[PDB]
Amino acid sequence: GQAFRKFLPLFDRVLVERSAAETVTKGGIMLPEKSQGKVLQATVVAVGSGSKGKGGEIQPVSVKVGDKVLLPEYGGTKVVLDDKDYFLFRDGDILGKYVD
């Protein structure tokens, strides 16, 4: 498993950074902050070693650092590193990967 800025998740976790906020629209209009929720597309920056539950050998995380992913809506913990909000999910919870 791989780390981040003086941080390393444990056993299953994945530390992500939510992507841009989408402040303006596509055509030409522009948006406030109370709307617009939390962006669900994110990039993975840290990855835990591997699943502890896997009998004998650890089962390593599948999402590798540097990927874009489609996050779930709810499951997730807020962590603050260098005053930047990063979110710590569990490997099973990550919905999709934006491969391209």
């Binding site: 629209t25 055509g27 209009i29 522009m30 948006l31 406030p32 109370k34």
Partner: protein, 92 residues
């Protein structure tokens, strides 16, 4: 003395909500020509309901007036915002 005042057109006793729609640099007026009109019976609460009307106005590049029961703080923050930067022409 007696005074004869001839109103030309329509008028109602109610002004703009936010004092940022003033584009006149004059006696505190918002003044448009060839504008659109959006007439809403109940309040414009959310960002959701107001954005399509503004997408129309910016696309056609005409000012827009918003006559509603009221303009809520959420849709209002969008209107003032789009007024103060690049400069969409709106008023409520």
């Amino acid at each position: 003395n007696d005074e004869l005042e001839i109103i030309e057109g329509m008028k109602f006793d109610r002004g703009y909500i936010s004092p940022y729609f003033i584009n006149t640099s004059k006696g505190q007026k918002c003044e448009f020509q060839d504008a659109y009109v959006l007439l809403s019976e109940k309040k414009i609460s959310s960002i959701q309901s107001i954005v399509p009307a503004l997408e129309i106005a910016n696309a056609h590049r005409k000012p827009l007036v918003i006559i509603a029961e009221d303009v809520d703080g959420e849709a209002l923050s969008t209107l003032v915002l789009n007024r103060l930067k690049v400069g969409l022409q709106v008023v409520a």
